[PDB]
Design a protein around this ligand. Structure first.
Ligand SMILES: OC[C@H]1O[C@@H](O[C@H]2[C@H](O)[C@@H](O)[C@H](O)O[C@@H]2CO)[C@H](O)[C@@H](O)[C@H]1O
Lengths: 135, 135
């Protein structure tokens, strides 16, 4: 399908950056993720880790700093379904990331690391990607 | 009847604010516009005047301060077509507005007036507005 998708962001990202991700959640998906990483090394810091878990019915947001994960935040319910397509907008603003799913504001994740450290977007897990666009 | 559509921006707009306009260009459309205004009074300043012209086949960007227009910036081609539907994204960033038309970054307009004064959205002219959503 789309396999782990990687998009580089050399200049980083600033408030007013929009990540639009469209794809399908396959019939037997357990979970997938969208990470905003700070480098290409494995286990690199994550300004944001968005993780819809269909197997447990939760959507988790977290960060990873200096090798250790922070405290997990959970969104309101699971707006994703196995066998259904989706569209997610992850908008960077001054104070955090707005996560919009299916045309509705879903969760706001206050910044934990400086937006300026982000260098790569990675998408992986049980999802079949249509497209990942960054505006 | 061409009564323009008017939409309030309750918390105003800041870097990270996304305007999503969906519509369809009428068959005999001449031109249409999206205005970001600073007040509800006829003749208020326009932080942004985005005006695609099918007849002159050119898209004009411009601001209007204290009654008079300013330096007009044109964009690359006409990403709109008569009788066809379009989806436009206007993204406010720290240094300007990014206009995205159907999956592609179209033009970047640097702030002339301050984001802080913008208070409403106006869409008028030859266009069938389907919806305006602010994220
Ligand atoms: O500046 C935006 C403003 O343009 C007016 O038309 C301009 C036009 O851009 C230019 O080709 C010509 O030389 O001058 C005209 C008038 O100053 C439009 O009439 C107005 O609706 C806006 O779109």
């Amino acid at each position: 399908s789309n396999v782990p998708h990687k998009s580089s962001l050399p200049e980083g990202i600033r408030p007013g950056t929009v990540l639009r991700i469209r794809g399908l959640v396959p019939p037997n998906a357990s979970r997938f993720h969208v990470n905003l990483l700070c480098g290409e090394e494995q286990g690199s810091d994550a300004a944001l880790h968005f993780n819809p878990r269909l197997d447990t019915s939760e959507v988790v947001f977290n960060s990873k700093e200096q090798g250790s994960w922070g405290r997990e935040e959970r969104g309101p319910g699971v707006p994703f379904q196995r066998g259904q397509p989706f569209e997610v907008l992850i908008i960077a603003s001054d104070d955090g990331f707005k996560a919009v799913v299916g045309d509705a504001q879903y969760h706001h994740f206050r910044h934990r690391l400086p937006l300026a450290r982000v260098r790569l977007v990675e998408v992986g897990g049980d999802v079949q990607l249509d497209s990942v666009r960054i505006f």
